[PDB]
Amino acid sequence: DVVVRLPDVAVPGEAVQASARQAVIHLVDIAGITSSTPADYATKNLYLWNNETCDALSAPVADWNDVSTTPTGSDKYGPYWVIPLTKESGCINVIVRDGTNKLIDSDLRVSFSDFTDRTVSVIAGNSAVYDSRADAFRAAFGVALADAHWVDKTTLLWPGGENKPIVRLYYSHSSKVAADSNGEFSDKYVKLTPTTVSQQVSMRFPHLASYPAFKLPDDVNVDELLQGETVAIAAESDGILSSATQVQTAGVLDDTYAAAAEALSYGAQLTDSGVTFRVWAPTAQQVELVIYSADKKVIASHPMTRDSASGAWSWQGGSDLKGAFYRYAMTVYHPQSRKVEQYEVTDPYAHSLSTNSEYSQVVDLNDSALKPEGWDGLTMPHAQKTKADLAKMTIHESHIRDLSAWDQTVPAELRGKYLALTAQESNMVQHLKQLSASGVTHIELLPVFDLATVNEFSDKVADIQQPFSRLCEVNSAVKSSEFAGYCDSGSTVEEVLTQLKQNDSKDNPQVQALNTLVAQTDSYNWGYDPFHYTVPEGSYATDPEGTARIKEFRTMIQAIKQDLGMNVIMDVVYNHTNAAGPTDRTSVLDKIVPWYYQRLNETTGSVESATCCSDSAPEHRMFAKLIADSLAVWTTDYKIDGFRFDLMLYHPKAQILSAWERIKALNPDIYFFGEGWDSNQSDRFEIASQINLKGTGIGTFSDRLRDAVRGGGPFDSGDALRQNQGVGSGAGVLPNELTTLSDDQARHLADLTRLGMAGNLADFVLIDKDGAVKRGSEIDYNGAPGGYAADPTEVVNYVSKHDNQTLWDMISYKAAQEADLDTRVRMQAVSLATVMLGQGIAFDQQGSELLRSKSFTRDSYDSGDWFNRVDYSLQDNNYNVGMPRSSDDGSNYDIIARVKDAVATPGETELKQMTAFYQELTALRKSSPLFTLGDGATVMKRVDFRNTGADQQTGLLVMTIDDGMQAGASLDSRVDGIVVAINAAPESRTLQDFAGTSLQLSAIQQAAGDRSLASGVQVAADGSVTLPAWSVAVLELPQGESQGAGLPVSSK
Ligand SMILES: [Mg+2]
Ligand SMILES: [Mg+2]
Ligand SMILES: [Mg+2]
Ligand SMILES: [Mg+2]
Ligand SMILES: [Mg+2]
């Protein structure tokens, strides 16, 4: 065996040592050192400049394009620069370049307190600064990056090993792999030989299938390598090092342990006979179960028992540990720090927690003490069994603080809490009860699992209803800000924000200036920040310490289902964790099995952040299991009726479907859906996208009718926000002063809208804007097939959601200056009509029925009670309460200032009219099964459109739904057919399509009189129907003695 060693060159001394008013920077050049050959470093140069952070440089060259700051000299080890300074304290900014290309991505900051001799060394592609070339040399010819992948028991994939005579896997249990003082790599190793990637590996890891493959001896003690650091090293045949890198091990962890580990159950499993704790930690060197008293004193520390087949650790004790607080004391190598870390971590399978999630807690969720009276018999108020059942789903996407934080008729101590839903006499609950009575069927809850980003210790939090003095007490940023003079005022924070409104504008956005500071220490966050996946959030409980929150959560679920009569959907956020690495307070999973539960860059091993935060890896078997097990608890123990997967596109199709198969065994009628856009993970696995989920019964949000009715798309900012009008805001037919939308473009949006009203099916046949016969898949959506679904239950239509601007704020952005306030209210209703009267599942943001505004805030996740306010006393819609946060919306300030004051802010009259409009629409959808056929083939047999093609009246949507003899059986004994007419236009429109029929305006709309969306509709003798501007009419063929002719779909 040849010894792997450093280059036969000697470890370098310093080329020059900085003198007075100088710094020296060495570049250790690996290429030039390995090459025998002399190097002309004339293309190497420094870009140097002073800023407020670093300012010690003397007369640095200003121009970026100036490459003439070439090396002062060079030797075999590389170039070096002698840099003139003005002082020897502080730090300098340095960008090391070749030509004008950065050799180090990090913009370096050489600190003269970190390195007091001001003589430093760096290596191309390495962000670290070294005190000597000797240190840099050992690093340049040491371990770098992490681009080797130990993907199964006997397979290593690694580009660094290609063509090299010696490829080895070096390992060290308690230290880092590194060369000794003789420059020899003296740790233990496994020898690897070249091989071809297997079919199994290429199937599992298609994004790695082009990597050079190397084979381990099929008898290696894998457990012994996996307990510490492993490093892949390649060398030349004389043993001289080629490269060394860290090893990503999730693959071999799954191949070695996953099946054995999948067969076990995890967490603190409490049951009569005792308790069994189990945690998966297949790389850990030691795991102890630490038991804590209620006052958080250690009362025991138990070495756990490792199971060799699975890599799980278990500990079995008596039932006296019920209610005990506990953590897992880990001894485990973390590849990010390259240290055998020592720390206590809460249970990833925690089912109860202490305040702020510091300790997990042993709980039996089956305990009757943790349930409201009657909980076990709680039934789902709305059926979800058939597709017809599912299609009735009409969702109200809500947030615990958005519901009750402002409602003075909710008891003060329940505002912002789960139990606010029990305050039957409150404005908010009475409003939801009427929404349910009129046909809202589901409450969807924004994150109510354990989020990280609200402090659950009440003393560390200040909300805007509390004294400004409390805010100063808990928030040193406020106390050091321009607002510090309010500290000893006697005003509440809300009182201050209110007085800041009058002088707030784009040139003085002081409301959001204060609110941005308030956001850091208030109770408010959407919560897409997972701390523990299977514990209720603590801050929404009146008592966040211990099991209390569990009963309060269930009391809320029971109130929504039993007393409000609505099903419950939970937002889940398995696509990322709040943090990873060995340090962060909220890194749980990545402390316990480092580098396994996060998705990592193939070259560097950095946790990726395509999401907001620390991307998870649901393609890994034990995280797929964690997800399914978590969903099982929410389903069984919390009686959740459905789940919305945040960013579902970062999950494999196979994993979401496996989860659904598992949960259907517990609740056969559970419904899964999520945001299924096309993602960038398709090189790693088939993603759970709109296209790939076709026919599976997993729903996805549709961006098709959304964009067509709202106008524009999620990538818009600046003038596009106003120019890109939608069907709901008058594309083509009521242009604003900025837009250039053509009539052809407006009719394309109507084609997408009709398609979406028919369920956005791939095979639905319609007549497009040009008179052409088109299947839904042939209607273009920004280059993609527009119709993608098999059944309308696979499509969730919407025109407003918690993310991006509210519908009202978009109408305010887009509406023509001459559209008055009453017209804009009808625009809101007409936009919602395309959703509520369509065949796809209907989804909507809490408060659209109240013209909800966020004061133009686009992304309000941390914009507090102020911008997310919903006023259930109906005094206004929260419009014009200050400029939104400048960091994200500042580039919109110009367009906001131009549009904001076009009309008055809605008041009680407009909000009451909007709620009437809204409940009219939901009542119509609820009233007949024809609106909610469920099955795509049935939609194709029954649903058609009029006013199509080249001669259409723009903006007039006319849909027919057949219940007559040609469709099959009568699904609705009262009618033979329905017509949905949405006149999204400022003209009256007359229809002759139904001349000679016995069409009648629906009784529901007639009863509303001049408060109806159909106010002023005329159904003449001859059967012609006229609709006023900005109106919606549902008309029907009354059913007689037998099923009649109906409205048969036209042959196309
Ligand atoms: Mg030095
Ligand atoms: Mg929390
Ligand atoms: Mg906040
Ligand atoms: Mg990638
Ligand atoms: Mg009928």
mmCIF file of C-alpha atoms in Angstrom, residues 694 761-765 774-777 787 789 940:
data_model
loop_
_atom_site.group_PDB
_atom_site.id
_atom_site.type_symbol
_atom_site.label_atom_id
_atom_site.label_comp_id
_atom_site.label_asym_id
_atom_site.label_seq_id
_atom_site.Cartn_x
_atom_site.Cartn_y
_atom_site.Cartn_z
ATOM 1 C CA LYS A 694 -52.834 14.332 -13.104
ATOM 2 C CA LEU A 761 -59.243 19.723 -17.322
ATOM 3 C CA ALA A 762 -56.727 18.612 -19.925
ATOM 4 C CA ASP A 763 -59.407 17.072 -22.189
ATOM 5 C CA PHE A 764 -62.278 19.567 -21.841
ATOM 6 C CA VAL A 765 -63.245 20.848 -25.311
ATOM 7 C CA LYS A 774 -59.330 23.321 -28.418
ATOM 8 C CA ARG A 775 -58.829 20.870 -25.606
ATOM 9 C CA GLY A 776 -57.872 22.432 -22.279
ATOM 10 C CA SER A 777 -54.309 21.148 -22.743
ATOM 11 C CA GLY A 787 -55.575 22.485 -18.710
ATOM 12 C CA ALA A 789 -56.264 17.884 -14.611
ATOM 13 C CA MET A 940 -67.217 16.980 -20.156
#
